[PDB]
Amino acid sequence: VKELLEAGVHFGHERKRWNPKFARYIYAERNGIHIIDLQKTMEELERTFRFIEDLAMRGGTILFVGTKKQAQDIVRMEAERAGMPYVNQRWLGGMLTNFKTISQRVHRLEELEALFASPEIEERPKKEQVRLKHELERLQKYLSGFRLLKRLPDAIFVVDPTKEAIAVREARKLFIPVIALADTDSDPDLVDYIIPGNDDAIRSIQLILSRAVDLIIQARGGVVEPSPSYALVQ
RNA sequence: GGAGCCCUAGCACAGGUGCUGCAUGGCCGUCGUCAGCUCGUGCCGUGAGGUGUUGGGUUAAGUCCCGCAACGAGCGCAACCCCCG
């Protein structure tokens, strides 16, 4: 089930590379590797979810990041089925602070979505049409998952604040609550709602997301079927 | 008697390739057709400021890509002009 399944092979993050605030989240250093306790998970996986249900109902919004490939393609699908924004490829500065300013790149799509139907293809000639294609392509690609926010979020969900603190400290200046999955390499002082564990365990990912999104759907109504991401493993 | 025009006398005068391009306006060359010059928002710094323009690669090129606390734009490259296929 929860930790029952998790208790399988989905913990323990690296070895002799850590930031000594995970002291209250580590069982033992047995056999060289560092191992994260799971009694504390439940004692921390609750309060997290518990106060999502205080926020998931009142129309709050959530952000999913994942500039690590072994989570990039996962956040992807698990974000649409969630219906909440996401930044799969790579995050870049300002998104939450320069919300107005980043949006012009998104609004651009509106002034670019006019084209692919409207009678200016016959007007707008090719040499800039062609070389704007990839521009439109790479504009959508890096920004799909942000093309659906004009209101600024109500949360942040991060696979690894060590990898994505750059997208956290932005939220931190906005007094916007920040949640994140944390590993032995993390820094569990800046995260508001802690979800410790191995973030680079490809396995310890897919199950985290549905179980995270299951609350999203259950907040909205009618849990469904996710995606058997096991094929994305080996 | 008067307007214009002409010559002769007094004028106000103009006139000078005389001087200073180290006093200037305008115009011209060099770097150089080099590829650089900057702004709005954001971030780092007490602050001047930095980032953006830096790193790898590519091209005639700040041309473009990856990454990057940055994302976009303006002047410039280009292209809109002309001759040839």
Swiss-Prot record:
Source taxon at top rank: Bacteria
Family affiliation: Belongs to the universal ribosomal protein uS2 family.
Molecular function in Gene Ontology: rRNA binding; structural constituent of ribosome
Cellular component annotations (GO), alphabetically ordered: cytosolic small ribosomal subunit
Any one Gene Ontology BP term: translation
Subunit structure: Part of the 30S ribosomal subunit. Contacts protein S8.
Coiled coil: 98-143
PROSITE patterns: RIBOSOMAL_S2_1 (PS00962)
Its job: Spans the head-body hinge region of the 30S subunit. Is loosely associated with the 30S subunit.
Membrane-traversing stretches: none
SUPFAM superfamilies given in the database record: Ribosomal protein S2
Keywords tagged on the record: Coiled coil, Ribonucleoprotein, Ribosomal protein, RNA-binding, rRNA-binding
Signal peptide extent: none
Pfam families in the cross-refs: Ribosomal_S2
UniProt-listed HAMAP family: Ribosomal_uS2_B
InterPro entries: Ribosomal_uS2, Ribosomal_uS2_bac/mit/plastid, Ribosomal_uS2_CS, Ribosomal_uS2_flav_dom_sf
Protein name: Small ribosomal subunit protein uS2
